[PDB]
Amino acid sequence: CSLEEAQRIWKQKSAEIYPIMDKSSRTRLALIICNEEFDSIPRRTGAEVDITGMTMLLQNLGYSVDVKKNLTASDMTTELEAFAHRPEHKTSDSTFLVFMSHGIREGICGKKHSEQVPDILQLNAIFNMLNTKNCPSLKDKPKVIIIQACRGDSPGVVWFKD
Amino acid sequence: AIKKAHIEKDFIAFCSSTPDNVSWRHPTMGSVFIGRLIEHMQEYACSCDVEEIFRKVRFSFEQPDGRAQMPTTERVTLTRCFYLFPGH
Numbered sequence: 310c311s312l313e314e315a316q317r318i319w320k321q322k323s324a325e326i327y328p329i330m331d332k333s334s335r336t337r338l339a340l341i342i343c344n345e346e347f348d349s350i351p352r353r354t355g356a357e358v359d360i361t362g363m364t365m366l367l368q369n370l371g372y373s374v375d376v377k378k379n380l381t382a383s384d385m386t387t388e389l390e391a392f393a394h395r396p397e398h399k400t401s402d403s404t405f406l407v408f409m410s411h412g413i414r415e416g417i418c419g420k421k422h423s424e425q426v427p428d429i430l431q432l433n434a435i436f437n438m439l440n441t442k443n444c445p446s447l448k449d450k451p452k453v454i455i456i457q458a459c460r461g462d463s464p465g466v467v468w469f470k471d
Numbered sequence: 472a473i474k475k476a477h478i479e480k481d482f483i484a485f486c487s488s489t490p491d492n493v494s495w496r497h498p499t500m501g502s503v504f505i506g507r508l509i510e511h512m513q514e515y516a517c518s519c520d521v522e523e524i525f526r527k528v529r530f531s532f533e534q535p536d537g538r539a540q541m542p543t544t545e546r547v548t549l550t551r552c553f554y555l556f557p558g559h
């Protein structure tokens with residue numbers, strides 16, 4: 310993780326920068342939700358390093374970082390509902406949410422998803438908990454949402470002729 | 472005593488693929504999206520800001536390899552530059 314002294318930055322598009330809060334009194338927070346076992350659909354082997362890398366990255370970046378794993382869409386809203394209330398937000402200049410699951414068109418999926426047994430956290434929902442209403446310590450304060458999950462079944466691509 | 476605030480501001484989502492389409496994740500090396508995110512976060516963290524950095528990683532997927540996927544940025548409501556001053 311590469312580092313510092315560039316004051317060029319505070320003299321660019323400044324005061325359209327986000328105000329950062331001093332490093333001595335920060336309680337910064339970040340959440341990794343990552344699912345690997347599922348009741349019915351293919352186990353996510355390799356998801357560990359996703360958790361690792363991201364947790365070190367985040368930590369390195371100046372963040373205390375919670376991991377929770379193997380959740381329903383339920384425990385996704387309820388745990389995430391909790392991340393909203395954590396009073397360290399008041400002394401934080403930002404946050405990082407990350408999810409890592411299987412996924413469908415509509416959303417991230419949870420522990421139990423099949424086509425007869427559906428389990429989906431909408432990307433809608435992530436936003437509706439973490440806003441000025443439900444998470445008020447975070448206004449005028451950036452929040453990035455990092456979703457590692459499949460968006461649907463199609464491979465990425467179209468053919469062209471050369 | 473009672474003023475108004477925007478209910479939605481300061482967000483940015485970053486996903487692994489575009490809609491309808493898939494995300495790769497290699498067995499012993501994690502998600503190719505995760506790997507790449509991390510790599511770019513390290514080197515560009517304060518050369519650049521998060522809109523920029525998230526652009527860059529999108530760029531690095533562009534000419535399709537065998538397991539193609541284009542990262543997308545939904546629903547950014549950042550009003551200001553998120554420079555991430557690593558070490559302050």
Ligand SMILES: *[C@@H](O)[C@H](CC(=O)O)NC(=O)[C@@H](CC(=O)NCCn1c(C)nc2ccccc21)C(C)C
Nearest residue numbers: 353410411412457458459493494495496497503538
């Ligand atoms: C979405 O449902 C998940 C991605 C996620 O974890 O977010 N998709 C998959 O797990 C796919 C399976 C997959 O990615 N397979 C990796 C295949 N593979 C191999 C053996 N070597 C590779 C190198 C680079 C990229 C992929 C590679 C789906 C398609 C079942």
